[PDB]
Amino acid sequence: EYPTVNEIPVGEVRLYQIADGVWSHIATQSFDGAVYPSNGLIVRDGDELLLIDTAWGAKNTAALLAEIEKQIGLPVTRAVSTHFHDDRVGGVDVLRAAGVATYASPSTRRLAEAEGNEIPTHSLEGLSSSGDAVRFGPVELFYPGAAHSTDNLVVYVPSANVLYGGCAVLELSRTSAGNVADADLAEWPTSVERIQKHYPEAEVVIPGHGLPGGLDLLQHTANVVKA
Ligand SMILES: [Zn+2]
Ligand SMILES: [Zn+2]
Numbered sequence: 001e002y003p004t005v006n007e008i009p010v011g012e013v014r015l016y017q018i019a020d021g022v023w024s025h026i027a028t029q030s031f032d033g034a035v036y037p038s039n040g041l042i043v044r045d046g047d048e049l050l051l052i053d054t055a056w057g058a059k060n061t062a063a064l065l066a067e068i069e070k071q072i073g074l075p076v077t078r079a080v081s082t083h084f085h086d087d088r089v090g091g092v093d094v095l096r097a098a099g100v101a102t103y104a105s106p107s108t109r110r111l112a113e114a115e116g117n118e119i120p121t122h123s124l125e126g127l128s129s130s131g132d133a134v135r136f137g138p139v140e141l142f143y144p145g146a147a148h149s150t151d152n153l154v155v156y157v158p159s160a161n162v163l164y165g166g167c168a169v170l171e172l173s174r175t176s177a178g179n180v181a182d183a184d185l186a187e188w189p190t191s192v193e194r195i196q197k198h199y200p201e202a203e204v205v206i207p208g209h210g211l212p213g214g215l216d217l218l219q220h221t222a223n224v225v226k227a
Helices: 058-071 092-097 106-115 188-198 216-226
Strands: 014-019 022-031 034-045 048-052 076-080 101-104 133-136 139-142 154-157 162-166 204-207
Touching: 014 058, 014 204, 022 058, 034 076, 034 154, 034 162, 034 204, 058 092, 076 092, 092 101, 101 106, 162 216, 188 216, 204 216
Parallel strands: 048 076, 076 101, 162 204
Antiparallel strands: 014 022, 022 034, 034 048, 133 139, 139 154, 154 162
């Protein structure tokens, strides 16, 4: 009973319990002639919440904050954007106005600015080269290399062995790689292989869009991109 677009009223957000102290957030947005869902993550960080990614636009991100307060009731104090596109940074200004400290890699921040997308305030150090990993409260942030975008990060939650792939990871039902305009199609299968090798104990894998599954999403992603 993972929410899909037909279950999510316009401008609304649903939360889904992944594990103890780990939720995904699902919202929908228009893109290229269709309505897409997209996923973000919420992780308990002590007495606070760590947010991964906006809910794709200001409206959705406002709804996300209201839904978190209603369902969980701990303050969101920090947010990480996993790449520079609007399903990851669109809503940063809302998060900042709400008192959330926003974070992204230096590369994500530079690309966001160049694209005219919203810019997270704070730079994440130690993610500049492929294979780099840093701890950020209750998660590990990992830079696997260029894939969906040159800057894309993935997020691992050690307590629950949850791998959040963002848009570098495709849902099983995906037939195409989606928006490849900023992708490195040559490097993407290799970046996915670095994810597979780094997180062999992953039990849940959450794509940027659509249904969670297992490690199979990673192979499926490699296969689709190769084709
Ligand atoms: Zn993207
Ligand atoms: Zn996306």
